[PDB]
Amino acid sequence: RDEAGITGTWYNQLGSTFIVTAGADGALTGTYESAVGNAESRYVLTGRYDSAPATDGSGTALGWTVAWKNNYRNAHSATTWSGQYVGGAEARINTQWLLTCGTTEANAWKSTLVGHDTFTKVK
Amino acid sequence: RDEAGITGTWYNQLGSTFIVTAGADGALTGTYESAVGNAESRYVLTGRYDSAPATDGSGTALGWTVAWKNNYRNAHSATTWSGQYVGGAEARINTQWLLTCGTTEANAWKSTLVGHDTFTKVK
Amino acid sequence: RDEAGITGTWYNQLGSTFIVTAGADGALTGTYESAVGNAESRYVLTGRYDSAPATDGSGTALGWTVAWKNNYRNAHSATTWSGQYVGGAEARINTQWLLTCGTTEANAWKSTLVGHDTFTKVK
Amino acid sequence: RDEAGITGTWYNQLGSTFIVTAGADGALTGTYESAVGNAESRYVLTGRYDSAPATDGSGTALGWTVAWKNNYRNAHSATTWSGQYVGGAEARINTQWLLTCGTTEANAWKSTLVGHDTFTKVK
């Protein structure tokens, strides 16, 4: 169980900062600050994680959401990251993500970006 | 603003049930019960949504996460749905989703499923 | 084996037309005309399919690519559809797709759209 | 135009080998050998690429498909990679991919894996 491992400040390859607390129950709460896109300052995030992972060297599944609205901007969009926490000398959170924009029904086909972020405790 | 529109009980094409409350602030809280997979009964969900969408007929971006652990099972996985709420006579939540399993670093390549769920207020 | 089942003219939910020949060997060749986006007229497509599927009622895996350049336009992008052919009274090709735009390394994070198309022999 | 840049032997982070020829017209033809999964030896691949990319430092969009059937195995599946070729001292092909298995209509929800491969000319 990785409540301790997860909780803290994480940085991705784009220079984004994800600050999270992991609850005993499975909760994830925090703030996200994106280095790119139509974003400034911190945005609320929430999510979930597996509080009793397999003990066989598997990763810890988890995910979280950011809606890109805060007191400064509203980018009419939401990203969800789905992935796994891997512990040990160089801990990582390896994710894939889906960003959906609010669109008209005619432009729905082009509503959703897909990418992959890797989070580390350093840089 | 679709706090009212979102809040409630939603059903997808697989026969799953998503029960959600949308907060004034952007919060989503609730429970998910999957008709398929390594799942039984209700699982906690949390997420976010755009509480002040565009007024130009665009959808309302949102997302949420379920970690597949509850008092009955632990499937060592998490799904995130990213999508948009569309209001009006036949309201829908149109999503794409990422399901990550906890895996060894050797099997990480096969950790993540992708699909699409459409939620309605009826069936 | 669905060489016969696949070959022909298919229409998706956006009103696009996919014309394909399936070879005995696994080849797919054809043309795609998109109802949406930065596209006009026909574009070359190529792909592959499983020429000896399982006989247990499973679908037939397949995929194909379109690069969005032809004599009329160049949208500096490529879509790949991955999915399965399901035969029988109402045959379908159920796909998920990835559209990558050519971008600068700074905008790479926003290079890739994800969606889902369902192809039928009618409409 | 990157006919020359693309053509050749490429290696990904899993230790897979992708051997490709790029045609003047936009064609990609070749063979793929996977380091992982239900695969052995070479499999046919085909695809497309943008033969006249933007000259503004953008990448070259492209994609390709492998159906996982050859003389040795049939894994009743197909992968499509969608991405972009980036040229220059350390050329890369940055991809995201969708792997669809042939499934029953009941298991269709779990038919499709998503991941990301980065290809280089060395290792």
How would you characterize this protein structure?
Four copies of one chain form a homotetramer. With 123 residues, chain A is mostly beta strands. Chain A has one domain: Avidin-like (Lipocalin, Beta Barrel). Chain A is built from one helix and eight strands. An eight-stranded antiparallel sheet of chain A has the order 1-2-3-4-5-6-7-8. Chains in contact: A-B, A-C, A-D, B-C, B-D, C-D. Chains A and B meet through β4, β5, β6 and β7 of A and β4, β5, β6 and β7 of B. Chains A, B, C, D: It comes from Streptomyces avidinii.
Q: Which terms would index this structure?
A:
eight-stranded antiparallel β-sheet; homotetramer; 54% strand; 123 residues; 3% helix; globular; 1 helix; Lipocalin; mainly beta
The CATH topology of chain A turns out to be Lipocalin
Arrangement of strands in the largest sheet of chain A: 1-2-3-4-5-6-7-8
- Residues in β-strands, percent of chain A: over 45%
In the CATH hierarchy, the architecture of chain A is Beta Barrel
Q: At the first level of CATH, what is the class of chain A? A: Mainly Beta
Coarse shape of chain A: globular
Q: How many domains in all of chain A? A: 1
Q: Helix and strand string of chain A, N-terminal first? A: HEEEEEEEE
Number of helices of chain A: 1
Could you tell me the number of beta strands of chain A?
8
PDB class: biotin binding protein
Keywords: beta-barrel, biotin binding protein, tetramer, cupredoxin, artificial metalloprotein, copper protein
Assembly: tetrameric
Entry title: Designed Artificial Cupredoxins
